[PDB]
Amino acid sequence: SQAEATRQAAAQEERLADLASDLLLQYLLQGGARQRGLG
Known about the structure:
Layout: H1 16-30
């Protein structure tokens, strides 16, 4: 979750296969309100 110059340039949209995977990692943070969690 870092950025130097731009983000759109090196985005994870072009590679759907990558998004489908990352979605699982991001989903963890995207959810988990009441239940246990870090956020």
